[PDB]
Structure 1
Amino acid sequence: FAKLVRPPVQIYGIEGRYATALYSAASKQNKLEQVEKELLRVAQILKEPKVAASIMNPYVKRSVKVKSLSDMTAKEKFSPLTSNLINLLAENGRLSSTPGVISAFSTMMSVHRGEVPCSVTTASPLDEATLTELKTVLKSFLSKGQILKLEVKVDPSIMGGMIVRIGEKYVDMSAKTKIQKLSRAMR
């Protein structure tokens, strides 16, 4: 066999085996951005009631579900290596798991420029000066030249503090400083 390039995330499952085998063929020949723009439009053209039907319907055949898809991917835009991918998903019966392969590929291609975003879950949204200060100290923490994305969630069960995660780091300044008052009891 030949060797294959390793993705920087390395997820597992029956959907990770198809997002890795495409990443080992599109990192070769330098086509990692052409497939991504194609894959974000094949997600749109599957979820139509003419086409979402008779792909999960088990009583058609294997071969005529290929021919109804071998011309659909040929006429509109595509003749890359990715036309073999839809041809291979329909042979193995794995055409149902096609949103699983696409959604895995975006995060596998995200990490080529992405940052595994944060989670600040404290309270109601605050003023602008508090937001820009955390966005300009977390930029000092990545040290990788990548413009970090972030999400904010509202959870009032934390009393007055906030929890912050950077990837897989998870600092903590929250109501667990009230649970640290067992030193008055357990001593």
Structure 2
Amino acid sequence: PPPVRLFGVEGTYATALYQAAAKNSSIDAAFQSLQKVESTVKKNPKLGHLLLNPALSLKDRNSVIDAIVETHKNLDGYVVNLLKVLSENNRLGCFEKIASDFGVLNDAHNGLLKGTVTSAEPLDPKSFKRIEKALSASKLVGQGKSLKLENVVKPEIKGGLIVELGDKTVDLSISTKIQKLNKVLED
């Protein structure tokens, strides 16, 4: 069964690819090869960026696919069928979209989570580590489900910090506390 539905469109494509290759039990290989073909698509810069946008036939599109699978042997067989589908649907524009989505599904299979501790300033490494530790200590990180912690700088939340991951947040920024303080003193 799906590793929890991602989007409705394009991630239905990813979901299908995923569940089909999950039952083939060859997801890491598929993902890696998809990364590799994605890399050689990107590293074909003219007409591997500028022929992601349709402008040519079904038959000509198919021959672009054929050149792509000529570029490296092996690409699973499920992602070789995925290329067929995309050629038939004449949409390579959402190819890297599917790649990213398949990546999300893949790293969901890994259980590798991504988080963020948004601040309005670059944060200490001690804070990064202590929070990563804290998050692992808590059941917020599943354990078997990994974590990345990304500080981003956003002046938006003036000072403070907000820890974010999953659908669980704790927001102890200064801007938000000020918002409530101001508001309560607007009474």
For normalisation by structure 1, the TM-score amounts to: 0.82
TM-superposed CA distance for 1:160, in Å, is: 4.3
**1:42 and 2:37 equivalent?**
yes
2:57 alignment partner, one of 39, 61, 79: 61
Change (3 A) 1:184 1:104: same
Q: Partner of 2:15: helix, strand, or coil?
A: helix
Q: Partner of 1:95: helix, strand, or coil?
A: coil
C-alpha separation in 2, matches of 1:136 and 1:76:
41
Which residue is 2:28 aligned to? 33
Structure 1 gaps, min length 5: none
Q: Partner of 1:29: helix, strand, or coil?
A: coil
CA contact (8 A) 1:74 1:83 kept: no
CA contact (8 A) 2:118 2:154 kept: no
1:23 alignment partner, one of 18, 24, 41: 18
Change (3 A) 1:57 1:136: closer
Which residue is 1:104 aligned to? 101
Structure 2 gaps, min length 5: none
C-alpha separation in 2, matches of 1:36 and 1:13:
20
C-alpha separation in 1, matches of 2:100 and 2:47:
22
Alignment of 1:21-170 (within 5 A): 21-47=16-42, 48=44, 49-54=46-51, 56-58=53-55, 60-70=56-66, 72-74=68-70, 76-78=72-74, 80-112=77-109, 113-126=111-124, 128-141=125-138, 142-170=141-169
CA contact (8 A) 1:121 1:154 kept: yes
1:12-56 Cα distance to aligned partner (Å, 9 max, x none):
233112101101210112111110011101112223214444553
Change (3 A) 1:171 1:76: same
Which residue is 1:184 aligned to? 185
CA contact (8 A) 2:52 2:93 kept: yes
Moved over 6 A (4+): none
C-alpha separation in 2, matches of 1:73 and 1:95:
14
Which residue is 2:2 aligned to? 6
The answer to which of 63-72 and 97-106 deviates more is: 63-72
Percent identity reads 25
TM-superposed CA distance for 1:151, in Å, is: 0.3
1:65-101 Cα distance to aligned partner (Å, 9 max, x none):
2134235315621262221111111011122211111
C-alpha separation in 2, matches of 1:156 and 1:57:
40
Larger Rg: 1
Opposite residue 112 of structure 2, the aligned amino acid is: G
C-alpha RMSD of the superposition: 2.3
Opposite residue 123 of structure 2, the aligned amino acid is: P
C-alpha separation in 2, matches of 1:134 and 1:22:
35
The answer to which of 161-170 and 75-84 deviates more is: 75-84
For normalisation by structure 2, the TM-score amounts to: 0.82
1:146-187 Cα distance to aligned partner (Å, 9 max, x none):
33111011234544421111221121112222222333342x
